[PDB]
Design a protein around this ligand. Structure first.
Ligand code: MG
Ligand code: MG
Lengths: 112, 83, 151, 127, 100, 99
RNA sequence: CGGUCCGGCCGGGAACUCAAAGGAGACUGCCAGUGAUAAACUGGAGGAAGGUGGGGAUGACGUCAAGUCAUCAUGGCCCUUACGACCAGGGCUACACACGUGCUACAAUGGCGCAUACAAAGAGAAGCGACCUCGCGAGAGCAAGCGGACCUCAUAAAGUGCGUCGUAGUCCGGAUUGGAGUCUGCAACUCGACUCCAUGAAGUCGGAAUCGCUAGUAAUCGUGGAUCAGAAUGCCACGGUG
């Protein structure tokens, strides 16, 4: 099936399949299934087909792939435009939470 | 952080100075020496020269800074590249 | 040790059936103090091998070990930085120990659904001289016997 | 009846109260199977009554209390031996002729200052 | 054992042992939710212009005899270098070298 | 009903202190329960004996604390006075409980 | 042995485990070989332990103008209206880099979750802080007992029986990121930790080199202790497996 605009694999468990959405981790995937009435030990196949569209409607209760992408982009751009410490450490490629960019800025500076 | 019910930490004197500025209607910058003080919504529309030891750096406080510390806008180190 | 020359220590009699060979196999197959699961795996594999070969478990294990049993250790007694190794005959105890260590190492080398299945599959090959143990024995013996002029 | 022993091993300590009748081993209230998981251990605590033949002719009742399966599993044996000896004493031989009469003193050394695990030493920075 | 630092520490005790009741009651009031916002704000504003160096958790525990600012021990109130010479001379009722 | 907790560091003197009260009770009364030694408390401390820089010079010391109980269940008219009129030796500490 | 609310609750007791005080106790003491008719070494017998029974402090004359006048004292120079002294804000925590050490992972002995088990030793009154009401979670409110073989920290895990996943940047790996509160100390932008929702990096046993261990030790798992308002992968200890 294709839930939330992405063709989730059919031959995987429902939790893992719905975890592929950009905006859900390993907890919201269980929570949505618990709140909508879907088991955590079945594949996309061997499941109600109307439940697919019910889940497609349910995943709109919070942020989604495009919504999360645009939210992150607008937050970063707002920080850059405001120009605080957050923006200064964001549009330079360095950690902003006070990490030492001396010997362990190694996936902010990239490989050397 | 601080407890939700304790309240902000605006200074005795800073509040008096901003009250003077807001009913006098003066455009001159108000210099402040405090660095761990919070921000109040009544300062929107004023220029605050905050002191960090080097220069009284100006802040033209927007309507987008109330719930944080005014000192986040003024770093103290001087570095924009190794070379 | 230069002056302190010690003997050989004694191990538990492996009360599952009772065999020093089995006890040594268990205590060399186990790692990270997981002797319980190591024993479960090795005993399941040996019980499967018993039916798979038609003989008794202990006899089938002993003959499989003998069929892949090596004879020469290739040690490094060179006088210095220059490469000068030497093959020598192996004492029976270290021979059996090295053979079963090679068996348990091939068990880890070849992967399958479970380590019990890997052990069973590799023992089913060491029974008719196949797998990895016999290949390693041949590969060590060829280079240990090709160098005879060096004493 | 009650011939008693006090097995010890690692930081453990047993208390066997052998008597005459039929297996019925029972440890710390639970029965053997229930108490000891690692089936291995469920054999150390039956080894002595095997070198004799009272596996099914005597009773028992233990209550070990210290350590872990690690060695509680063993203290039973020692004891089951000390008390087996007090059943007839002619058994002293076979039981010593099997290692079941010695108390292993193997303890656990102390982290010494500078080392990091009793013996292991901080890696040395080459030159 | 700097003389300048040996007076600030005693001031931080001679002033912190006086504001105990007011600070305790203020902490209790601002910690109990059953209070009023204006009263809590006035209380915290009054507390903050109290002398800064009179706070309880604003003085580092200083050694008694030598005033070493590191390695202060609660049991003896002395640093390691002085407790060594004390226990070695034998003035500490029970301090013997040990061996577990 | 009445008991004394003796706290000391020396077993060669806490025993004398215990004797000096148990014999006093058995003299001006009876019905004693003897000295009950509680598990002694040992507190260990590792101390660096390096003045400026040596992260290897350590000394491992320990402080002992020996505790004993002397309870006289049945007191007479003289037991409490005899055990309180004592000229207690220095070093030892007494915690007396008269419930 | 008895009542028994099935709990040692007490009635009782000092055989035991435990609690602290005094001791017996392994000394080549023995039998045999070797060795110089020695010392000793090797076996075996008793023994709980055997050859030092097993671990720790105790560091011999001296070597390194070895290291600290920054614990401290200290003979000389020294500043005496400042090198003495005053508090607030920063910075000791930063950075194109290279290095000692360790934690964290490479995934089928491995992660996901549900019964279920066994430790020692510790710290506690400006304290340790049981319950309970709550919070997906940190902890909020109310709050018993206890200078403690009494109460707390503290349902320890690895183990075990099930299920489950199936070899994939992985339901591995948990870092960076936006925001949220919480502990905490007047105040966490520089600069705490905890939390859980969300992005889910790197990395897939790593050259030359190189270090640690000879037995309850390597190796793994968790707990405890001191510093201190909180802020341990560092330090010191403790036992389980083995
Ligand atoms: Mg002997
Ligand atoms: Mg502090």
């Amino acid at each position: 099936a294709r839930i939330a605009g992405i063709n989730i694999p059919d031959h995987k468990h429902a939790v893992i399949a719905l975890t592929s959405i950009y905006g859900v981790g390993k907890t919201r995937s269980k929570a949505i299934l618990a709140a909508a009435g879907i088991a955590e030990d079945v594949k996309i196949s061997e499941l109600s087909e109307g439940q697919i569209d019910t889940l497609r409607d349910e995943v709109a209760k919070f942020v989604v792939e495009g919504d999360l992408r645009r939210e992150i982009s607008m937050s970063i751009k707002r920080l850059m435009d405001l120009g605080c410490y957050r923006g200064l450490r964001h549009r330079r490629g360095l950690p902003v939470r006070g990490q030492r960019t001396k010997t362990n800025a190694r996936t902010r500076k990239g490989p050397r | 952080p601080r407890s939700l019910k304790k309240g902000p930490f605006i200074d005795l004197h800073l509040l008096k100075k901003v009250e003077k500025a807001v009913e006098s209607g003066d455009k001159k910058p108000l210099r402040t020496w405090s660095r761990r003080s919070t921000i109040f919504p009544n300062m929107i529309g004023l220029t605050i020269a905050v002191h960090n030891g080097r220069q009284h750096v100006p802040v033209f406080v927007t309507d987008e800074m109330v719930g944080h510390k005014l000192g986040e806008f003024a770093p103290t180190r001087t570095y924009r590249g190794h070379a | 040790p230069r002056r302190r020359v010690i003997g050989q220590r004694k191990i538990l009699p492996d009360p599952k059936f009772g065999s020093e060979l089995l006890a040594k196999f268990v205590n060399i197959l186990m790692v990270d103090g997981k002797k319980s699961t190591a024993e479960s795996i090795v005993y399941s594999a040996l019980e499967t091998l018993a039916q798979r070969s038609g003989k008794s478990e202990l006899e089938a294990f002993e003959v499989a070990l003998e069929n892949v049993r090596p004879t020469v250790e290739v040690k490094s007694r060179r006088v210095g930085g220059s490469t000068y190794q030497v093959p020598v005959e192996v004492r029976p105890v270290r021979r059996n120990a090295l053979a079963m260590r090679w068996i348990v190492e091939a068990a880890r080398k070849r992967g399958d659904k479970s380590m019990a299945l890997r052990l069973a599959n590799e023992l089913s090959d060491a029974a008719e001289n196949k797998g990895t143990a016999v290949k390693k024995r041949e590969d060590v013996h060829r280079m240990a016997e090709a160098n005879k002029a060096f004493a | 009846n009650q011939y008693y022993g006090t097995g010890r091993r690692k930081s453990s300590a047993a208390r066997v109260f052998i008597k005459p009748g039929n297996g019925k081993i029972v440890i710390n209230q639970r029965s053997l199977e229930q108490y000891f998981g690692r089936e291995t251990a469920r054999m150390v605590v039956r080894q002595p009554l095997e070198l004799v033949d009272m596996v099914e002719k005597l009773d028992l009742y233990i209550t070990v209390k210290g350590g872990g399966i690690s060695g509680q599993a063993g203290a039973i044996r020692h004891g089951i031996t000390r008390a087996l000896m007090e059943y007839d004493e002619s058994l002293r031989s076979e039981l010593r002729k099997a290692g079941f009469v010695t108390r292993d003193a193997r303890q656990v050394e102390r982290k010494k200052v500078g080392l990091r695990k009793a013996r292991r030493r901080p890696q040395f920075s080459k030159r | 054992a700097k003389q300048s630092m040996k007076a600030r520490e005693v001031k931080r005790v001679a002033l912190a042992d006086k504001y105990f009741a007011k600070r305790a009651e203020l902490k209790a009031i601002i910690s109990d939710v059953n209070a009023s916002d204006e009263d809590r704000w006035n209380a915290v504003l009054k507390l903050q212009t109290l002398p800064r160096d009179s706070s309880p958790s604003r003085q580092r525990n200083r050694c008694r005899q030598t005033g070493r600012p590191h390695g202060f021990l609660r049991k003896f109130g002395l640093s390691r270098i002085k407790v060594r010479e004390a226990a070695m001379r034998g003035e500490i009722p029970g301090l013997k070298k040990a061996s577990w | 009903r009445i008991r004394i907790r003796l706290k000391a560091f020396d077993h060669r003197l806490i025993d004398q202190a215990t004797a000096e009260i148990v014999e006093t009770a058995k003299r001006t009364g009876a019905q004693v329960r003897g000295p009950i030694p509680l598990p002694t408390r040992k507190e260990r401390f590792t101390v660096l004996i390096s003045p400026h820089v040596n992260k290897d010079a350590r000394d491992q010391y320990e402080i002992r604390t020996h505790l004993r109980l002397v309870d006289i269940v049945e007191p007479t008219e003289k037991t409490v006075d005899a055990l309180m009129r004592l000229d207690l030796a220095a070093g030892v500490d007494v915690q007396i409980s008269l419930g």
